[PDB]
């Protein structure tokens, strides 16, 4: 009962062949583990900073969220799904997407600009990784 | 106003030339950060186990509690003072001594049998290290 594109993406997440081209904007502490507004404010902070965004591929699977740098092939983010609490697109930016995870006892929001997809497509993919997480 | 031996030991702790010959009995989780009875029950557990006690020297200073193995010279315990909450001798054993420290969020009690001193002498020395900790 999902949209076709989302049903296909779910297949790709479950076989660990789902990746999206992104700029990784970095991360910022957030004070809550969930909430669309919490993410949207984090992304606003990340966009306001002068730090250079990093081009790469966001791989989504039950094994984790992996961000591989295009320029260097370095694995610059490797996030286990069990520490991720929430993900959302951005009502302020059609390609914005972020997720909240454990930092220790703190929460961090990791922010992205998708190069050629809507943020909600990335959000749904990460939500499929959540499903696999619960299954394991 | 301390006993002479304790005043001298305080001098040795503050110049990092205070050490005591011990058997290190290991450690056991405790559920409280302080309390003579909590330590005495931990030591009872440690004495009941079949694990081999390790002979060495317990060095006491503001820089930490260090246990150096006699046989190997290996530094087998290296405990910062700022993570140690409490120390006490043992009313059940004249040479027993233990301290409670952070494990993460848990508490652990590290237990000792002093080879040729009373446990209360070791306890006072470690209490002097507490004083230095507060000064720093």
């Amino acid at each position: 009962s999902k949209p076709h594109q989302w049903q296909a993406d779910e297949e790709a997440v479950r076989s660990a062949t789902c990746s999206f081209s992104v700029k990784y904007l970095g991360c910022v502490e957030v004070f809550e583990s969930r909430g669309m507004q919490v993410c949207e404010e984090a992304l606003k902070v990340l966009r306001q900073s002068r730090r250079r965004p990093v081009r790469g591929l966001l791989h989504v699977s039950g094994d984790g969220l992996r961000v591989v740098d295009d320029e260097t092939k370095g694995l610059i983010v490797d996030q286990t799904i069990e520490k991720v609490s929430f993900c959302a697109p951005d009502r302020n930016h059609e390609r914005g997407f972020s997720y909240i995870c454990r930092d220790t006892r703190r929460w961090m929001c990791h922010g992205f600009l998708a190069c050629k997809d809507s943020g909600e497509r990335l959000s749904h993919a990460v939500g499929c990784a959540f499903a696999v997480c619960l299954e394991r | 106003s301390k006993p002479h031996q304790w005043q001298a030991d305080e001098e040795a702790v503050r110049s990092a030339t205070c050490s005591f010959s011990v058997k290190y009995l290991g450690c056991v989780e405790v559920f409280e950060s302080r309390g003579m009875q909590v330590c005495e029950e931990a030591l009872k557990v440690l004495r009941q186990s079949r694990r081999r006690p390790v002979r060495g020297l317990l060095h006491v200073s503001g820089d930490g509690l260090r246990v150096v193995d006699d046989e190997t010279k290996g530094l087998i315990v290296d405990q910062t003072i700022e993570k140690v909450s409490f120390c006490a001798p043992d009313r059940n054993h004249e040479r027993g001594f233990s301290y409670i420290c952070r494990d993460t969020r848990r508490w652990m009690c590290h237990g000792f049998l002093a080879c040729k001193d009373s446990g209360e002498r070791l306890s006072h020395a470690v209490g002097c290290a507490f004083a230095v900790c507060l000064e720093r």
């Binding site: 069990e82 991720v84 929430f86 959302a88 697109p89 943020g119 997480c133 | 993460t104 652990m108």
Partner: peptide
């Protein structure tokens, strides 16, 4: 816009490193 495409992780782990010197309680 209203909130959309938001997901909470039901598998989020809310809830120990081995110490060879540690004695286990019984």
């Amino acid at each position: 816009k209203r909130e959309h495409a938001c997901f909470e992780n039901p598998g989020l782990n809310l809830e120990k490193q081995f110490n060879p010197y540690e004695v286990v309680r019984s």
